[PDB]
Symmetry: C2
Subunit: 139 residues, 2 copies
């Protein structure tokens, strides 16, 4: 199948640097978090991943819902992205998702979230390398 949408982001200046999308829309400063001895002044790869995953997973829920018989405003995702030390003195990403769906039964929410992980390109991207944990809430 052919690519539906493609975008480019340039990163310069290292841990302290900037990201800028090639059209200029998204531009921001990066900082090492304080936990890694930086200023915590600005965003970082972990937070950008959390943001993208939270948005991607919420959109994927609506893709699932339109395939079958829930609105955009019935869906909330909280991504918790962490960094854990591996053996060889590098880092691995961890991910926990809190998914809140309004107006649906506990059973239906569990089914929708399971199917959403099969649709969501972030989930498909990281499967087997990051064990994503998910908690499903209803409201």
């Amino acid at each position: 199948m052919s690519t539906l949408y493609s975008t480019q982001v340039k990163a310069v200046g290292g841990c302290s640097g900037t990201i800028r999308s090639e059209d200029g829309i998204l531009e921001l400063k990066l900082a090492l978090p304080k936990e890694l001895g930086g200023k915590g002044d600005a965003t970082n790869p972990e937070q950008l991943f959390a943001a993208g995953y939270a948005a991607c997973f919420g959109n994927a829920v609506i893709h699932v819902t339109r395939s079958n018989k829930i609105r955009d405003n019935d869906v909330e995702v909280l991504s918790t992205v962490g960094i854990v030390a591996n053996g060889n003195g590098g880092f691995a990403l961890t991910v926990h998702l809190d998914v809140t769906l309004s107006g649906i039964s506990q059973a239906d929410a569990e089914k929708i979230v399971e199917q959403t992980h099969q649709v969501c390109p972030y989930s498909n991207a990281i499967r087997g390398n990051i064990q994503v944990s998910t908690t499903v809430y209803t409201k």
Copy 2:
């Protein structure tokens, strides 16, 4: 065991909604891009992943190089352009495509290729997607 750093982002309102880190540091509007029939006003998951990866990879180059002690590549010696696409997969869902253009300053073409190959083994984003996405990489010097 320990988590060294953890961060939380809330997303509401769908592809035209918002994300907000719990510490308020990151706050931005989402839009559907023009290629998909939206205003293309604002960011989206492909652009956020391209930004996170480009940043993470360039940082891993610096971490790797910190004691390749010979050229000692600095912050301004590394540029990463990530190209991220979304495509239908076989199966009712979507996959990302990732291409990186890595440009390193002040080092030989052969040294740059070796450094990039090492940093893919150390980069948390590269390690996260291995076996699911075939990342393609083009290495440049200047």
